[PDB]
Design a protein around this ligand. Structure first.
Ligand code: HEM
Ligand SMILES: O=C(O)[C@H](Cc1ccccc1)NC(=O)[C@@H]1CCCN1C(=O)OCc1ccccc1
Ligand SMILES: C[C@H](N)c1ccccc1
Length: 454
């Protein structure tokens, strides 16, 4: 039994001003490097503890001992995501209900049904790049977000955002991004009292109304037509929870749609961006990956079966998730009084934060080379210890979208590597923008077509 280290303090603000930065996760990563596997973090009326070691995170991941907590970031996202899967407590009736209805829609099996629609968007990405002139470059995060948003639109609700036809966002996305922006900015802030932030508050209320009206219309216009298009919206309108026997009500369905639209703008787009970054910075790896893409994707249109064969492309994506897990933290609470790691006594209710990028750098798991991009670490998936690798979180509150994310990222990265050579023509310096998620800002490449017909 021993006392926790704590980073530097600002009198009565405690540690809060440490979050007065547009890169809080990165600042928390540098604090973990200084203080080690566990530190205390206090704000006025709040105390959490950041975990960085596999030794302590394997205990936090014990579902008999700890459950999902909504962090301050999750409570602010709930103002527009409501009791959707990502922002609901495990004990809220709508969590288990929604989880049991949607779990079949997100299985490895359901991916065979989404495949055609994903390919439709991936082919739009490849044609865009095939049609660039010699002088031009690729804005990598911008194009990946166009792809992932369009993919979740079409598979989710049979809606085309047509992001490859635009350089200005949909009225929904403007509100959605501006809501999320306001939600992360609030973390550091003084209070919800300053008249200054009323304008930020006014705007936030108009954005919640805009997202709510446009998604409530979508539900309404789909119940209008009676059409049964095999999409998440159909599954949610017809689907019945086997426990309660009930379907979701229209309000919860609107919350699920908002939740899914954010995920598929903010997470998979980041994975693909990091993955391409590590590939252009590691030529030997790009070469192994492009060899597999060219051998496997022998048809102009990739099949489900062919994407499952891209083992090494899978390993690249897992290595990108290891260094830069795009949803970098999740929050837990003690269900009862308990002792963490034989050393840190917690009371019932006490909060933990899992710093996933730090977990993924634990030299006692991964060796001394933790900063190296080596997809070969993942050649043998049973060599990875339990709870050493948690990019999709933990237990029943893990990412429902995991197989959807990996199928889309494997398909698209497969096709990119099949169709183009890539040049890091600016020698890009990694600059990680923090929203809810991580993305590489300003990441630009050139592609040189291999002139393979679609
Ligand atoms: C590479 C992409 C993604 C990563 C790294 C990721 C990561 C995560 C993680 C770490 C959690 C746990 C959060 C927590 O404990 O607070 C989570 C939950 C969730 N994710 Fe994802 N995600 C990704 C893509 C997606 C996609 C594409 C969707 C939807 C189509 C999605 C939907 C969700 C939902 C609904 C939850 C809450 C599930 C529940 O608790 O019942 N995610 N994700
Ligand atoms: O939101 C929190 O409670 C903490 C930050 C905090 C604020 C006030 C007092 C004490 C701690 N959040 C976090 O540690 C991290 C860093 C910034 C975002 N974040 C987070 O966990 O956001 C929720 C989230 C959403 C989506 C994906 C991962 C994580
Ligand atoms: C990280 C998680 N997959 C997420 C879910 C919904 C909205 C934003 C993020």
């Amino acid at each position: 039994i021993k006392e926790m280290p704590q980073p530097k303090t600002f009198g009565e603000l405690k540690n809060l001003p440490l979050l007065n930065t547009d890169k809080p996760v990165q600042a928390l990563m540098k604090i973990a490097d200084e203080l080690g596997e566990i530190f205390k973090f206090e704000a006025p009326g709040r105390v959490t503890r950041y975990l960085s070691s596999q030794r302590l995170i394997k205990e936090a991941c014990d579902e008999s001992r700890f459950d999902k907590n909504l962090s301050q970031a999750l409570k602010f996202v709930r103002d527009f995501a409501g009791d959707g899967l990502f922002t609901s407590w495990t004990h809220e009736k709508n969590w288990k209900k929604a989880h049991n209805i949607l779990l079949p829609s997100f299985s490895q099996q359901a991916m065979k049904g989404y495949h055609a629609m994903m390919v439709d968007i991936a082919v739009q990405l490849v044609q865009k790049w095939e049609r660039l002139n010699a002088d031009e470059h690729i804005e990598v995060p911008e194009d990946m977000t166009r792809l992932t948003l369009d993919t979740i639109g079409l598979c989710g609700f049979n809606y085309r955002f047509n992001s490859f036809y635009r350089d200005q966002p949909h009225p929904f996305i403007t509100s959605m991004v501006r809501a999320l922006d306001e939600a992360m900015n609030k973390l550091q802030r003084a209070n919800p009292d300053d008249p200054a932030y009323d304008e930020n508050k006014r705007q936030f209320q108009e954005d919640i109304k805009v997202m709510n009206d446009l998604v409530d219309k979508i539900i309404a216009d789909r119940k209008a037509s009676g059409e049964q298009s095999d999409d998440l919206l159909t599954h949610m309108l017809n689907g019945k929870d086997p426990e309660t026997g009930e379907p979701l009500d229209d309000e919860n369905i609107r919350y699920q749609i908002i939740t899914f639209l954010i995920a598929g703008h903010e997470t998979t787009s980041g994975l693909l961006s990091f993955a391409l970054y590590f590939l252009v910075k590691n030529p030997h790896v790009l070469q192994k990956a492009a060899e597999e893409a060219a051998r496997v994707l022998v048809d102009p249109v990739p099949s489900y079966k062919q994407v499952k064969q891209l083992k090494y492309v899978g390993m690249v994506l897992n290595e990108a998730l290891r260094l830069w897990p795009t949803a970098p933290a999740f929050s837990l609470y003690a269900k009862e009084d308990t002792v963490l790691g034989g050393e840190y006594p917690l009371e019932k209710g006490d909060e933990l934060m899992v710093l996933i990028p730090q977990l993924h750098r634990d030299k006692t798991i991964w060796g001394d080379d933790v900063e190296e991009f080596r997809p070969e670490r993942f050649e043998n998936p049973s060599a990875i210890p339990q709870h050493a690798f948690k990019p999709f979180g933990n237990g029943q509150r893990a990412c429902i979208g995991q197989q959807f994310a990996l199928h889309e990222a494997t398909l698209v990265l497969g096709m990119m590597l099949k169709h183009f050579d890539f040049e890091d023509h600016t020698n890009y310096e990694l600059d990680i923008k923090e929203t809810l998620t991580l993305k590489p800002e300003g990441f630009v490449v050139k592609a040189k077509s291999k002139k393979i017909p679609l």
